[PDB]
Design a protein around this motif. Structure first.
Motif, PDB file in Angstrom:
ATOM      1  N   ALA A 234       0.830  -1.200   0.000  1.00 51.56           N
ATOM      2  CA  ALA A 234       0.000   0.000   0.000  1.00 51.56           C
ATOM      3  C   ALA A 234       0.866   1.253   0.000  1.00 51.56           C
ATOM      4  O   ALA A 234       0.893   1.986  -0.993  1.00 51.56           O
ATOM      5  N   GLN A 235       1.587   1.487   1.102  1.00 50.66           N
ATOM      6  CA  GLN A 235       2.591   2.554   1.204  1.00 50.66           C
ATOM      7  C   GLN A 235       2.034   3.921   0.810  1.00 50.66           C
ATOM      8  O   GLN A 235       2.748   4.760   0.255  1.00 50.66           O
ATOM      9  N   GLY A 236       0.758   4.158   1.100  1.00 48.18           N
ATOM     10  CA  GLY A 236       0.113   5.389   0.686  1.00 48.18           C
ATOM     11  C   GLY A 236       0.021   5.524  -0.820  1.00 48.18           C
ATOM     12  O   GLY A 236       0.346   6.577  -1.377  1.00 48.18           O
ATOM     13  N   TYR A 237      -0.403   4.455  -1.491  1.00 48.69           N
ATOM     14  CA  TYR A 237      -0.553   4.450  -2.944  1.00 48.69           C
ATOM     15  C   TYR A 237      -1.840   3.713  -3.283  1.00 48.69           C
ATOM     16  O   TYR A 237      -1.922   2.494  -3.105  1.00 48.69           O
ATOM     17  N   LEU A 238      -2.835   4.447  -3.776  1.00 52.03           N
ATOM     18  CA  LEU A 238      -4.118   3.848  -4.119  1.00 52.03           C
ATOM     19  C   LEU A 238      -3.955   2.874  -5.278  1.00 52.03           C
ATOM     20  O   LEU A 238      -3.575   3.266  -6.385  1.00 52.03           O
TER      21      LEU A 238
ATOM     22  N   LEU B 237     -12.525   1.404  -0.267  1.00 51.98           N
ATOM     23  CA  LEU B 237     -12.034   2.662   0.277  1.00 51.98           C
ATOM     24  C   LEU B 237     -13.201   3.533   0.718  1.00 51.98           C
ATOM     25  O   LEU B 237     -14.355   3.302   0.349  1.00 51.98           O
TER      26      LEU B 237
ATOM     27  N   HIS C  29     -15.532  13.492   3.229  1.00 47.46           N
ATOM     28  CA  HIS C  29     -15.477  14.820   2.624  1.00 47.46           C
ATOM     29  C   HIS C  29     -14.936  15.870   3.589  1.00 47.46           C
ATOM     30  O   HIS C  29     -13.941  16.538   3.293  1.00 47.46           O
TER      31      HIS C  29
ATOM     32  N   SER D 110       2.693   6.023  -7.156  1.00 50.53           N
ATOM     33  CA  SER D 110       2.316   6.265  -5.760  1.00 50.53           C
ATOM     34  C   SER D 110       1.934   7.730  -5.544  1.00 50.53           C
ATOM     35  O   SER D 110       2.352   8.373  -4.579  1.00 50.53           O
TER      36      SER D 110
ATOM     37  N   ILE E 231      -1.165   9.247  -5.086  1.00 47.50           N
ATOM     38  CA  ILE E 231      -2.220   9.575  -4.132  1.00 47.50           C
ATOM     39  C   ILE E 231      -2.023   8.742  -2.875  1.00 47.50           C
ATOM     40  O   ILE E 231      -1.880   7.515  -2.949  1.00 47.50           O
ATOM     41  N   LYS E 232      -2.021   9.407  -1.723  1.00 46.41           N
ATOM     42  CA  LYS E 232      -1.926   8.724  -0.445  1.00 46.41           C
ATOM     43  C   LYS E 232      -3.298   8.227   0.000  1.00 46.41           C
ATOM     44  O   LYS E 232      -4.342   8.730  -0.424  1.00 46.41           O
ATOM     45  N   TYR E 233      -3.285   7.217   0.872  1.00 46.80           N
ATOM     46  CA  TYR E 233      -4.532   6.638   1.356  1.00 46.80           C
ATOM     47  C   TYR E 233      -5.233   7.539   2.363  1.00 46.80           C
ATOM     48  O   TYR E 233      -6.468   7.566   2.407  1.00 46.80           O
TER      49      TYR E 233
ATOM     50  N   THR F 262     -19.902  18.236  -4.588  1.00 46.87           N
ATOM     51  CA  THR F 262     -19.842  19.381  -3.687  1.00 46.87           C
ATOM     52  C   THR F 262     -21.023  19.277  -2.730  1.00 46.87           C
ATOM     53  O   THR F 262     -22.110  18.868  -3.140  1.00 46.87           O
ATOM     54  N   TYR F 263     -20.805  19.616  -1.460  1.00 45.88           N
ATOM     55  CA  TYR F 263     -21.896  19.552  -0.496  1.00 45.88           C
ATOM     56  C   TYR F 263     -22.961  20.599  -0.808  1.00 45.88           C
ATOM     57  O   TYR F 263     -22.686  21.641  -1.409  1.00 45.88           O
TER      58      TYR F 263
END
Lengths: 141, 34, 40, 45, 75, 48, 41
Positions: A123-127, A133, A137, B10, B12-14, B31-32
């Motif tokens: 994973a390592q912060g990689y989607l 998921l 918001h 890599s 985008i971070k989770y 958008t809300y």
């Protein structure tokens, strides 16, 4: 129990006995000892189970093309034939059951392979492509 | 960029990235609305 | 460039067969929680 | 064990071959000559 | 189960004098199947075969005495 | 005695026909189960 | 025997009408049909 004697990451060569495991169902693809499966022949039926003991749960890859032959690093995009277990069966596409139907028939059938997701990075912060998921918001709710 | 046969981005971070998902036809969409 | 398949990898099963004058790439699918036999 | 029960099961699969009593002990025995005549060698089991 | 005609059918097939040297597959079968069969189920021995064997002096069944005495023993 | 009478009648009708055969001329101990059922039914009828 | 039986089952030979759907070896009705057609043109 298992007590495996292998380091791992060994590249699969033509003729090696292989084991398949479902990434979701957690079981292993096998040749069931039952019969029928809406077929009228000496063939068997394919299914999943948990126990890995016995000669079942194992498949041997044989090259359909003479270009590669036995004992080669199986590359991507090739054609493979799977024949093992207790009837020397093949993953045959039986179209006679009003549609495509996989059964442990005795006639060989082409079967290609593809790389689906990855085998190197965590994973390592990689989607990654294909995962469960969230969609937060406001970062809290 | 059409051929995808390997990735080492890599990008985008989770849980350390903010997404602003944009539909192909509209432009913002999400958008809300209280 | 040389690529192959090892253990702990991303294998998935595909085959093309023109049935009723239609070529299609079928994939092997199964699920243990609802059934046993597989379906394309 | 070893390539023996395998071939035995393959031969047994051809269920139908398990029950062949109706063929082995079938009775079209045909006395043929019987009393005096009709010794059909050419046609008949 | 029951009492089939195995005590007399085999002898009736054996006494056919037309085949020659084909009996050699008959007396070992008879001798072993007489000992294998229980004496309780073996009830058609005298009138079935032994009376005819006694009436016969030097017939083709020379081993009739041995066949009768296989299961006789001494108890 | 009934079997002997039936066999004699069958032989007489075969001689009257001028040609034919029948494998039913079988001793009682050599009879099969299909005719043994009829024999048992006849024995039960005689007993009753 | 191994190669003989393997090459026999990898290509069915007889035409068994009792099996009908299968390749052959329909011994249930094949000999009956043969003995019926024996007394026939």
């Amino acid at each position: 129990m298992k007590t495996a004697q292998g380091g791992g990451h060994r590249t699969l060569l033509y003729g090696h006995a292989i084991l398949l495991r479902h990434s979701y169902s957690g079981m292993y693809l096998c040749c069931l000892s039952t019969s029928r499966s809406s077929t009228d022949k000496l063939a068997f039926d394919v299914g999943l189970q948990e126990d890995t003991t016995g000669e079942a749960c194992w498949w041997t890859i044989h090259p359909a093309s003479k270009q590669r032959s036995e004992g080669e690093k199986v590359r991507v995009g090739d054609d493979l034939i799977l024949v093992s277990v207790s009837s020397e069966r093949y993953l045959h596409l039986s179209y006679g059951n009003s549609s495509w139907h996989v059964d442990a028939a005795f006639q060989q059938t082409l079967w290609s392979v593809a790389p689906i997701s990855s085998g190197s990075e965590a994973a390592q912060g990689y989607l990654i492509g294909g995962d469960v998921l969230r969609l937060l918001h406001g970062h809290m709710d | 960029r059409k051929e995808v046969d390997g990735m080492g981005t890599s990008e985008i971070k989770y849980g350390d990235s903010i997404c602003y998902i944009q539909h192909v036809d509209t432009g913002l969409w999400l958008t809300y609305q209280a | 460039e040389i690529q192959f398949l090892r253990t702990d990898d991303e294998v998935v099963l595909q085959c093309t067969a023109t049935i009723h004058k239609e070529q299609q790439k079928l994939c092997l699918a199964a699920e243990g929680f609802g059934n046993r036999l597989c379906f394309l | 064990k070893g390539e023996a029960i395998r071939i035995r099961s393959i031969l047994r699969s051809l269920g139908d071959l398990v029950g062949v009593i109706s063929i082995a002990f079938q009775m079209p025995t045909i006395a043929k000559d019987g009393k005096v005549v009709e010794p059909d060698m050419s046609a008949g089991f | 189960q029951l009492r089939p005609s195995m005590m007399q059918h085999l002898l009736r097939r054996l006494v056919f004098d037309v085949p020659l040297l084909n009996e050699h597959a008959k007396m070992p079968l008879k001798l072993l199947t007489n000992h294998y069969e229980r004496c309780w189920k073996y009830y058609c021995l005298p009138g079935g075969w032994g009376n005819f064997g006694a009436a016969s002096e030097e017939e083709l069944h020379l081993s009739r005495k041995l066949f009768w005495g296989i299961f006789d023993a001494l108890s | 005695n009934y079997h002997n009478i039936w066999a004699k009648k069958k032989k007489l009708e075969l001689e009257s026909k001028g040609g034919g055969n029948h494998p039913l001329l079988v001793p009682y101990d050599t009879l099969t189960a299909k005719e043994k059922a009829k024999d048992r039914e006849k024995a039960q009828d005689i007993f009753k | 025997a191994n190669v003989v039986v393997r090459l026999l089952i990898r290509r069915p030979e007889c035409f068994g009408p009792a099996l009908r759907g299968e390749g052959g070896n329909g011994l249930l009705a094949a000999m009956e049909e043969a003995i019926k057609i024996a007394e026939d043109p």
